[PDB]
């Protein structure tokens, strides 16, 4: 499988999109970025111009005005218009994100100190997912020859250290996945940048997110609410596969 949902050296953009929701985030952010880069350049060029034009050597006698009504009206309404425009594109995207559709696949995720537990209630599958290199796999949260070997064996490389887990959450491509997220002990947060999803895993609460992956591959997230000593060391691996490979993975877990 292709490693897609990961940071890339020196990157300045988002991680690749692999869901319709992530696509929407990329578009909305790109739209707002144009606007705020325009606002910033504007403000910056005004300051630099004013300093050049009205420097004490060039403008020896200062003006005394403290009002300009048409300008004050313009500079109040224009921001209001800008925000209404943003909100108009932004709220539909928000509604799409947060309205949970009917699930093809249901996964229940539980955050623990410091690992994730996955249950597929329809399939009677459950398992735990530890960072490769955590105490669970024989390590102590650092790279070493043994850890590199384990990364290789699991189908990764040393570059995926801190991202790759011993087990992965496997799902089929082009299906609606609904994830129910909770915490077992403290608050954790479950996320996959490539899917445009993040949801805190709060003890006592069950919260839902959805995604539909649009291509096969490997996608990583990392725990996103400080949860103690190994917060930096309990990541998330999702493998998106064909319907048939997903079924094959399911049958591998079936006890006869």
């Amino acid at each position: 499988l292709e490693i897609i949902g990961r940071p890339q050296p020196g990157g300045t953009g988002f991680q690749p999109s692999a869901s319709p929701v992530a696509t929407q985030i990329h578009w909305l952010d790109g739209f707002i970025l144009v606007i705020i880069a325009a606002i910033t350049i504007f403000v910056t060029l005004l300051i630099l111009y004013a300093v050049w034009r009205f420097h004490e050597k060039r403008n020896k006698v200062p003006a005394r005005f403290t009002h300009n009504s048409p300008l004050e009206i313009a500079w109040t309404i224009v921001p209001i218009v800008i925000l209404v425009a943003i909100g108009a594109f932004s709220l539909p995207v928000l509604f799409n994100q947060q309205e949970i559709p009917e699930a093809d696949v249901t996964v229940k995720v539980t955050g623990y100190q410091w690992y994730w537990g996955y249950e597929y209630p329809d399939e009677e599958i459950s398992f735990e997912s530890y960072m490769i290199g955590s105490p669970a796999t024989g390590g102590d949260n650092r790279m070493s020859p043994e850890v590199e070997q384990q990364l290789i064996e699991a189908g990764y490389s040393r570059d995926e250290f801190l991202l790759a887990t011993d087990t992965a959450m496997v799902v089929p491509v082009n299906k609606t996945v609904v994830v129910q997220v909770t915490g077992a002990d403290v608050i954790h947060s479950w996320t996959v940048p490539a899917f445009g999803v993040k949801q805190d895993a709060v003890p006592g609460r069950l919260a839902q997110l959805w995604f539909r992956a649009e291509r096969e591959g490997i996608f990583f997230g990392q725990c996103s609410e400080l949860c103690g000593i190994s917060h930096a060391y309990m990541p998330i691996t999702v493998k998106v596969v064909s319907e048939e490979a997903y079924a094959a993975w399911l049958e591998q877990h079936h006890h006869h």
Binding site: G11, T12, I39, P62, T76, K198, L226
Partner: protein
């Protein structure tokens, strides 16, 4: 002598707060240097568990030199303790004491023509509560804490159940520190409000009060509502930890998310409390060095009032991924966007003030112009973050760290530096050397931008907050960010050299007003320094 610490005069108390805030600022900045040493490269090299086997002093020095990864067992607890220490010191024991406690106490009474403040004894007590709070915060770092080590690794906002399950009593000491800070702020706020209302000079009507005095007045009101709420939130943590309550524990029927609502109800106002006095200083400085009266005095006052008021109805934008309903998320997104209008606008008034003026690029003016640029860069990423759909991606990433170091951290810092250079002659009778002030500015300006701009990239690439270590792909921009931090630190040590020089052998100030006629408020009417008894 220790006749400084028993003084009740607003000017002496102001000076005490500035120096103390500066010293705590140095400690907290030093934490960030250590933080950026560890983040400079992937793999853990400094915060090694092996250093714990040594003594406290021996372990300290060993942890300042890098080890090979093979000799360094990562110690995440130390990372967590350092960043929590950095955040708490900054938010409770540095910038507000400097701006509100320091410049607020020194200058607001001067600006309104008050010869004394309503409660000089209460003012002196506020300072001592600040010092006691600082001492406890620092003590918590050396107290039995989480994971069988010292200190609390819980984040500056202390989310339960993590904060309530952290072992030892380090966390209880930190909660007490915060109680003492709140008390200091509340006493100060009561003093500021009563002085402002009862002790203005004859003729000094509400429409003639300088913008800085207004900024302090508005800030004081924010404190009285926000700080008691925080005191509630942290007392409930204290009782969950020690007295058998289960406010935030699901097993007893509690909800950890309740804490977040209460904490953030304080937590938003807190940032406006930080920045409002910096707005006041910027207004005084720009008017002086543009040689032109402030554009739209009354809109400036009303914008500050509106920001103050609206800052109480936006808190849950800090909770978009915590499990808020779609209705809640939509509301808070819209309330947040609204507050962006009075706030982002004051920027235009500051530019309009410069427009048509006769601009002198002295050190205080450079800080003020730096403020306008940097507060804009920060405010504008705030707008991005207000959009809940995009915050889904950015929340708890370095993009948020970049934002707040931009609007808030550097805004308060550039406002503080603007005040120091603006007012040091007035407070001390000695003038700073101009070339050194400018060099400080350019070093800090380049340093701070190199530190924080690349953190936007790290966040867009999905780097989470509160991590001792990170995937190798994040290496380039963490390296740049760290070099920026080291240059900023160099600029701050140079600054402390500038202050030492100024106070020991700076050129003697001989004028009441050593700037120009457009520094038109009452402090510039008094001697440098002012007499023990003013007006």
């Amino acid at each position: 002598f220790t006749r400084w610490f028993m003084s009740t005069n607003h000017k002496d108390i102001g000076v005490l707060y500035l120096f103390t805030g500066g010293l705590v600022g140095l400690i907290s900045v030093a934490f960030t240097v250590y933080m950026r040493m560890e983040l400079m490269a992937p793999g853990v090299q400094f915060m090694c568990a092996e250093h714990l086997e040594s003594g406290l002093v021996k372990g300290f020095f060993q942890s300042l030199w890098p080890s090979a990864v093979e000799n360094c067992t990562p110690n995440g607890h130390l990372w967590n303790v350092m960043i929590t220490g950095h955040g708490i010191l900054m938010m409770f024991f540095v910038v507000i004491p400097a701006l509100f406690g320091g410049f607020g106490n020194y200058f607001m009474p001067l600006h309104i023509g008050a010869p004394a403040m309503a409660f000089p004894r209460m003012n002196n007590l506020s300072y001592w509560l600040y010092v006691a709070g600082t001492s406890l915060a620092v003590a918590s770092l050396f107290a039995p804490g989480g994971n069988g080590q010292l200190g609390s690794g819980i984040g500056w906002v202390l989310y339960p159940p993590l904060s309530t399950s952290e072992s030892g009593y380090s966390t209880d000491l930190a909660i007490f520190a915060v109680h003492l800070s709140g008390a200091s702020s509340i006493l100060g706020a009561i003093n500021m409000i009563t002085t402002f209302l009862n002790m203005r000079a004859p003729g000094m009507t509400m429409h003639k009060v300088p913008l800085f005095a207004w900024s302090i007045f508005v800030t004081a009101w924010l404190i009285l509502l926000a700080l008691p709420v925080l005191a509630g939130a942290i007392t409930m943590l204290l009782t969950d930890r020690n007295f058998g309550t289960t406010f935030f524990q699901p097993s007893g029927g509690g909800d950890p998310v309740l804490y977040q609502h209460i904490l953030w109800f304080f937590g938003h106002p807190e940032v406006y409390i930080i920045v409002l006095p910096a707005f006041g200083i910027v207004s005084h400085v720009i008017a002086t060095f543009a040689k032109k009266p402030i554009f739209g005095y009354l809109p400036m006052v009303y914008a500050m009032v509106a920001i103050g008021v609206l800052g109480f109805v936006v808190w849950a934008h800090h909770m978009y991924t915590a499990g808020l309903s779609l209705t809640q998320q939509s509301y808070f997104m819209m309330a947040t966007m609204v507050i962006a209008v009075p706030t982002g606008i004051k920027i235009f008034s500051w530019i309009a003030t410069m427009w048509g003026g006769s601009i002198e690029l002295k050190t205080p003016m450079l800080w003020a112009l730096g403020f306008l640029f940097l507060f804009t860069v920060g405010g504008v990423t705030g707008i991005v973050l207000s959009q809940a759909s995009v915050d889904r991606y950015y929340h708890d990433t370095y993009y948020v760290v970049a934002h707040f170091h931009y609007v808030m951290s550097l805004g308060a810092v550039f406002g503080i530096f603007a005040g120091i250079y603006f007012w040091i002659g007035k407070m001390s009778g000695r003038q700073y050397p101009e070339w050194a002030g400018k060099l400080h500015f350019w070093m800090m300006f380049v340093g701070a931008n190199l530190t924080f701009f690349p953190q936007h990239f790290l966040g867009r690439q999905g780097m989470p907050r509160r991590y001792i270590d990170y995937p190798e792909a994040f290496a380039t921009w963490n390296f740049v960010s760290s070099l920026g931090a080291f240059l900023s630190f160099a600029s701050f040590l140079f600054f402390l050299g500038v202050i030492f020089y100024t106070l020991t052998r700076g050129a003697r100030v001989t004028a009441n007003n050593y700037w120009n006629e457009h520094a038109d408020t009452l402090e510039w009417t008094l001697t440098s320094p002012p007499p023990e008894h003013t007006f």
